Amino acid sequence: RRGADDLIGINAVLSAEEREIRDTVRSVVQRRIKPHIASWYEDGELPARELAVELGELGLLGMHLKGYGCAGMSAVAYGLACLELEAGDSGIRSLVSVQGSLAMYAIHAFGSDEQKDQWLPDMASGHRIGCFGLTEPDHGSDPAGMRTRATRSGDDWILTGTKMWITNGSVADVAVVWARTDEGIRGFVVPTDTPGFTANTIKSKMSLRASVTSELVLDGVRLPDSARLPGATSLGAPLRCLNEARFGIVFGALGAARDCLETALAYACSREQFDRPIGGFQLTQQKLADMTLEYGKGFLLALHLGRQKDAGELAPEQVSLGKLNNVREAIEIARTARTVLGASGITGEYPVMRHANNLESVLTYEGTSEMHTLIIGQALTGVGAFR
Amino acid sequence: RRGADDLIGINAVLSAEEREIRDTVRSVVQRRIKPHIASWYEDGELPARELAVELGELGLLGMHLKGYGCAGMSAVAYGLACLELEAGDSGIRSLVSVQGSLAMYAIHAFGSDEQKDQWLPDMASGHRIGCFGLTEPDHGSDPAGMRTRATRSGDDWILTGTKMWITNGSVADVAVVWARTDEGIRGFVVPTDTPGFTANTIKSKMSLRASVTSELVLDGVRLPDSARLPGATSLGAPLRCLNEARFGIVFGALGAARDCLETALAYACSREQFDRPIGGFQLTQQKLADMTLEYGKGFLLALHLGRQKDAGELAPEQVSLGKLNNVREAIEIARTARTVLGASGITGEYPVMRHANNLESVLTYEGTSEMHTLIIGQALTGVGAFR
Amino acid sequence: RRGADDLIGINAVLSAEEREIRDTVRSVVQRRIKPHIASWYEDGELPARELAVELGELGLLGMHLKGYGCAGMSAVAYGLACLELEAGDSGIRSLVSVQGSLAMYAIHAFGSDEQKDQWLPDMASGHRIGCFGLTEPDHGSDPAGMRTRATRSGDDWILTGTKMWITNGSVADVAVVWARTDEGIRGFVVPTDTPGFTANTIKSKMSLRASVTSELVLDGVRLPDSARLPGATSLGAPLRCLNEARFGIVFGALGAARDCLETALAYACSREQFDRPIGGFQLTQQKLADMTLEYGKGFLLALHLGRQKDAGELAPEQVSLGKLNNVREAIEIARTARTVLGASGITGEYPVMRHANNLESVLTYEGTSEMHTLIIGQALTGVGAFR
Amino acid sequence: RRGADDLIGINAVLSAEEREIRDTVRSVVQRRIKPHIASWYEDGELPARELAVELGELGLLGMHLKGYGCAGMSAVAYGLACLELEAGDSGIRSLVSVQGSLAMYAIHAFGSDEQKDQWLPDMASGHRIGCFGLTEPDHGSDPAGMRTRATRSGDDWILTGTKMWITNGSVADVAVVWARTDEGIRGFVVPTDTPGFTANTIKSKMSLRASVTSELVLDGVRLPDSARLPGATSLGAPLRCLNEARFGIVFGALGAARDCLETALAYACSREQFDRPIGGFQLTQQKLADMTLEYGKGFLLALHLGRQKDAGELAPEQVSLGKLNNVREAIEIARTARTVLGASGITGEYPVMRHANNLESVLTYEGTSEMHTLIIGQALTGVGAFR
Ligand SMILES: Cc1cc2c(cc1C)N(C[C@H](O)[C@H](O)[C@H](O)COP(=O)(O)OP(=O)(O)OC[C@H]1O[C@@H](n3cnc4c(N)ncnc43)[C@H](O)[C@@H]1O)c1[nH]c(=O)[nH]c(=O)c1N2
Ligand SMILES: Cc1cc2c(cc1C)N(C[C@H](O)[C@H](O)[C@H](O)COP(=O)(O)OP(=O)(O)OC[C@H]1O[C@@H](n3cnc4c(N)ncnc43)[C@H](O)[C@@H]1O)c1[nH]c(=O)[nH]c(=O)c1N2
Ligand SMILES: Cc1cc2c(cc1C)N(C[C@H](O)[C@H](O)[C@H](O)COP(=O)(O)OP(=O)(O)OC[C@H]1O[C@@H](n3cnc4c(N)ncnc43)[C@H](O)[C@@H]1O)c1[nH]c(=O)[nH]c(=O)c1N2
Ligand SMILES: Cc1cc2c(cc1C)N(C[C@H](O)[C@H](O)[C@H](O)COP(=O)(O)OP(=O)(O)OC[C@H]1O[C@@H](n3cnc4c(N)ncnc43)[C@H](O)[C@@H]1O)c1[nH]c(=O)[nH]c(=O)c1N2
Ligand SMILES: [Cl-]
Ligand SMILES: [Cl-]
Numbered sequence A, B, C, D: 001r002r003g004a005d006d007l008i009g010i011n012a013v014l015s016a017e018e019r020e021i022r023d024t025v026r027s028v029v030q031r032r033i034k035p036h037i038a039s040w041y042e043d044g045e046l047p048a049r050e051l052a053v054e055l056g057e058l059g060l061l062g063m064h065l066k067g068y069g070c071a072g073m074s075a076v077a078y079g080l081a082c083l084e085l086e087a088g089d090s091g092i093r094s095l096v097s098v099q100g101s102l103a104m105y106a107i108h109a110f111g112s113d114e115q116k117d118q119w120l121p122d123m124a125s126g127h128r129i130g131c132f133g134l135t136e137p138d139h140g141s142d143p144a145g146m147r148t149r150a151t152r153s154g155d156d157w158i159l160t161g162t163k164m165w166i167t168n169g170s171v172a173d174v175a176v177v178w179a180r181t182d183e184g185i186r187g188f189v190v191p192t193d194t195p196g197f198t199a200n201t202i203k204s205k206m207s208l209r210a211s212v213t214s215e216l217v218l219d220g221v222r223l224p225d226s227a228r229l230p231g232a233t234s235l236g237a238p239l240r241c242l243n244e245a246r247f248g249i250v251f252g253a254l255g256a257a258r259d260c261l262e263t264a265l266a267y268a269c270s271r272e273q274f275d276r277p278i279g280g281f282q283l284t285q286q287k288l289a290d291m292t293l294e295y296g297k298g299f300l301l302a303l304h305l306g307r308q309k310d311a312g313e314l315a316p317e318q319v320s321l322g323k324l325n326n327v328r329e330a331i332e333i334a335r336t337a338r339t340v341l342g343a344s345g346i347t348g349e350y351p352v353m354r355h356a357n358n359l360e361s362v363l364t365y366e367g368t369s370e371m372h373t374l375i376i377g378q379a380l381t382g383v384g385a386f387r
């Protein structure tokens, strides 16, 4: 029996430095996440604040950023880290994506030196948690239509609106909030203790239950001009953040896929029915071959994109190739794997249903499958088809 | 806007009697199931005993059986009832399938007059709950390999083994248990208070959470010969029961599909993005068209099979056409529908994730997709390919 | 071994009258089409004029029309006839569709009594061949944009434009030609000997090679006002004709599917590999089950639509369900069947490649898959998404 | 507008040497193959002998072999060459695959020095054409079951049997023929002028029409022992040859895909319907995105396998990943591309139907999709499921 990674030949196309980072994160996941995750997911509650500190002190927050206590690792090493985190759980990887590639990235890329120096080192250590308030109840795929507004009042700004589906929102110390102004989209560094700001936890989730997801109500929150991100002057600012986060998801989704594929492979060799291992039936082999193919193609695509990113050669339409492909192929792998487990596959004895349900959120967030199709389509044709 | 049933033209191919039964069950579901189901599913607990009484007193237990207080309705009317029940929830329809088409059916078909007279009227009223113990930890798709044994001891039988994944097991008054004997497979009517018999509820389910699913331990349970089902003399007896239950699932799965499709259709007309209803985008219309097609083809297949069943013309390989097709197409409808809802689709605000997760169990139980493929294949070729 | 029709149970849902018509057409196909079709297809040439006479004298032209020597058969019987014709070859069924459901239908529905009396009886006998000139080089899916014009000159009309992909065009005696005028779309009965009218046969076809497909050049063709179809006053006139033809295709495509499925079933039982019939392998059974399911669902959909049509209950969006589904599922059946035949499947020893290539034209013509998706989508949502 | 190769970023992961070879072969294809291929394919006839000389003198026969006038290029460069050849036509690439990776390879790997010195330089120049006789009428996927026999007669061998579907057979000077003997499978270098040897061209092909495909009849062909390949002592010998040829197909199939994708991309930008380029509709963009993804994933898989092959790290189950994936994804690309062209796509004005029909043979030969599934399955599970 050859495992999927062995059959694909993954280690041989990575460096020793990359493999070391991957191995380090895998060990963190096996030790600190996997023993608890079934319970956190079932309960829909996790010690998010304590976990952020743990992960930050381990060097896992802001991994792809430079300075301020961050790891400054390569795009490929960061990708491998995300893959390992998500093999643990997509909710856990989501906490990390929002912290580093959304909230910290926004401050790193568009913030004043005062904002960077105030927030980034404590965010890298996990002692202060961020969130990224873009989506609203009525505006998700079309953030250009956002209705949260920032209006001037003397030297201050007044922020009024509601953000929805905001990861980490209820446990966040700081919110990077996007708003429309009379001169275009702007972003603000919003301490969550500011009067007028409330965060409400979303309950009854059937996906991403080991993550905090919130409504943010900005009920006329008054901020000084110094709270504005000076470098953010258009919708392109939040979109640059999304493209950073999307890259991590390109790798991350493959971790959930891998965990499911490995589960199905092991089960197909151990479980017998009709006097042979179920892996000895053609219909089982078809599934295992198909899943291994999409995992391997997805990994080679992710690695290619990461190598391009490190070389400085990576556009949003290229990231969209990876995001469109790897998330939908991952969720199909999870679904197929569950069928191989039969009834055993319907409980948290195995990770497959958790992965499959989690991947519903990953499929939708950071641009739906349709959004990525249209981004790629526009690149290929020169014609937008969003409207 | 035309709804899916209107576009397909369903009412015109049903009788007034059939439509009345359908409407009656729909009203029961809307009144007695839908207001509570989100909570029952989340909690993984429901008042199963009280619900059985409610459903029985409403005429909904043993619907397709004749006599003993049962409705004696046609195959088509029974199918429509199952569709409505499952549009409520597959777990609820499962409680009903096990009660009527498995446990009562077995007694009705193979029982002595003493067994029928003792058990069936109280089962039809819901005052006594049954379960059907075929599957074991190591034998599911291949029940011919079952290892639960029944051995003679004087005039008594001693039953020893474990059954697993048994719907209603922990709340059952009576268990119809299948065992191997020196002269072939036999079935027994096992009061669950018999010494040596225990039932343990399976927890941590990610599917069918509004149903009771159990392990049955038969630790040398001593029964008189009068507990044996006299008419059951081979594996064909439990298989006849499965074919009755499978028929109800052929219709039932379409109810979960319908509920999801209707949800997606309504949302596509109400939700706007990029300044139009999302139903005004081609990619949305593709989904809605594809889902409506598979729902309608699945319904026409179910109706055809039901008409054959009423005419006396329905073989197991024909039932397998419906079971193979309608469950996998239903789960694909649920999955696709969830994508149309975006983030809103990930909570129990909408029924789609519950339906999709429930359908995992329906896909596996009563013969997996692979089993039905091989049943149809053997019919088409004359050659078995199970081994 | 049960054949697909036997497993589905088709004869039991048809009348004796319907079965008789079906059987009669099957015999015509077996005797007059199947012995020659491989040669006609390879050559890309067939005795179309002689064949039209044969088919007309057999009662097969204008089958669903009433009067003028036409059969006046039901929608269901007509459908079954089309299925049998296409099981022979889609090109042959195309000749018939254009003759009856397009060219004759247009005259029957919108013509003057003079036009009907002049043309229809000789068209029903096959002694005069029609064609239906809607599509142009630059306008296919959007016939509202057609640029062929009809302009008044005294009491005459002058028709100027080019029609393209016109079945029967080079062998037609009469062309029903659609044109834009200052008062909307109009249709004309155009004798093909009219000065200025030329028809050029399209060559190098890789599909529908046993059909004549042509360019029509109307180079200022002068016609009296009596050539205008008086009842045709908008784009809805040619669209009504298309909806008649589409209905026949709903059934027709299933004939090509059936022929391929039957071929694969027979081969799977006869061909041995690895010491068993290839039908004894699970992967083969998967294909045979899947194909049989889509054939049967497609047939039940077609029959349902035909029963609605006879009852007067059939809208264009309902026809589109059948056209969208049955053509794409038929072509997938043909493709899958070819794989079962291995190398033997690549020559005209078997009909599968001819059917698969023919179905490319059927998938595109009478509204592409995308057009039908959007017709169904608009019906479901109330919102057009063509633009 | 970004082309597919540009969007994927292919040149940046190749060397200048690799790009030069690719470019050289592309120019040969554009100049010597593309102007004639529509006619050769339609006619089912090509100047195969003259073409072999042309290709050999250009260095394109035996590209991956060392010595004897062969190019000795890397696995990656050879792959790129095959991709370019097949973008021309799969039939043409097939002539090359059989010449180099089957017939020459067999002699190179298992032949005596006398055989190598006699045959290989004239095969590399194209002045002598080879074929590879493994498949028989009744044994294709299971060559272990072959019935062509070689029996000893004094110091001679007598070869008796029929080989079928043999590329280049009717134009071959030499046939590498596999036979069963009393001591296992053996291979023979068979001059085609040997008495008793006849080759018959297979006609009525609907695929690979620009290739010669033949029946070989070995009617008691008498050969000296020196005709035996000394190094071939089991079924593993012909299988090693297949694994060499399969590798070239992993790349080759992507060339047919590319040509189709490029065709669809150009057409989507040029063709207007409903007042916009058809590439401006969402359903068109979905197709273009999906095709580009599978082309790019397939290319990254091929390149990965080629890099492994050059490093000495490439097993048959790894080759099977590429063969299974790239051929079925290529044929799906061709099919999808044809739909984008509408009616224009059904003639040889565009290359898509030729590519799609050619790929039917590529899907089947060198191991069917099912064979590759089972090779991968056995590697993953340790259990064979062929029987
Ligand atoms: C658990 C979780 C966590 C988060 C988030 C979501 C979830 C579920 N998101 C929000 C996420 O980014 C958001 O859900 C997506 O952008 C999709 O937006 P909507 O859900 O509003 O769907 P929306 O209403 O946009 O779309 C609904 C459906 O219509 C389709 N559609 C929309 N426009 C279309 C068009 N023009 N053409 C074709 N189809 C179209 C969509 O693809 C989708 O299928 C978030 N956000 C945030 O700011 N910060 C965060 O931390 C997170 N985290
Ligand atoms: C919630 C719920 C509720 C119930 C039940 C299940 C569940 C999940 N069932 C049990 C159910 O019938 C059982 O799960 C199925 O028969 C499948 O058996 P296993 O789960 O053991 O899978 P099993 O181990 O048989 O199969 C595992 C996988 O291997 C495949 N496979 C097996 N044999 C194969 C072959 N020869 N060729 C190809 N593939 C093959 C299967 O298709 C599946 O994908 C049950 N039972 C009962 O007796 N009473 C009840 O009330 C219920 N209720
Ligand atoms: C062999 C044969 C025979 C005939 C015919 C065709 C063929 C191949 N037809 C013509 C046929 O009706 C025509 O090909 C189709 O209507 C499609 O039009 P075009 O080929 O111009 O494609 P067109 O250019 O319209 O479309 C090209 C592609 O773009 C897509 N597309 C177009 N608009 C779109 C939109 N708004 N949104 C999304 N996608 C869109 C299409 O679905 C297609 O995939 C015909 N005609 C006739 O009048 N009489 C006849 O007898 C016949 N017979
Ligand atoms: C144009 C062209 C050109 C060539 C060739 C073919 C063609 C079409 N081939 C022959 C080719 O290698 C051969 O067609 C394939 O190996 C498949 O064998 P059969 O066609 O006999 O199908 P076969 O009869 O083996 O299989 C029929 C079907 O059954 C399936 N099947 C078979 N066994 C199965 C199993 N155990 N489980 C599941 N499914 C199974 C197959 O996958 C296939 O779908 C060839 N050969 C050669 O020696 N030299 C050459 O040059 C060429 N060239
Ligand atoms: Cl991050
Ligand atoms: Cl746009």
Ligand SMILES: [Cl-]
Pocket: B061, B062, B063, B064, B096, B097, B098, B099, B100, B101, B102, B248
């Ligand atoms: Cl029941």
Ligand SMILES: [Cl-]
Pocket: B383, B384, B385, B386, B387
């Ligand atoms: Cl069997």
Ligand SMILES: [Cl-]
Pocket: C061, C062, C063, C064, C096, C097, C098, C099, C100, C101, C102, C248
């Ligand atoms: Cl007709």
Ligand SMILES: [Cl-]
Pocket: C383, C384, C385, C386, C387
């Ligand atoms: Cl529109």
Ligand SMILES: [Cl-]
Pocket: D061, D062, D063, D064, D096, D097, D098, D099, D100, D101, D102, D248
């Ligand atoms: Cl070669």
Ligand SMILES: [Cl-]
Pocket: D383, D384, D385, D386, D387
């Ligand atoms: Cl084997």
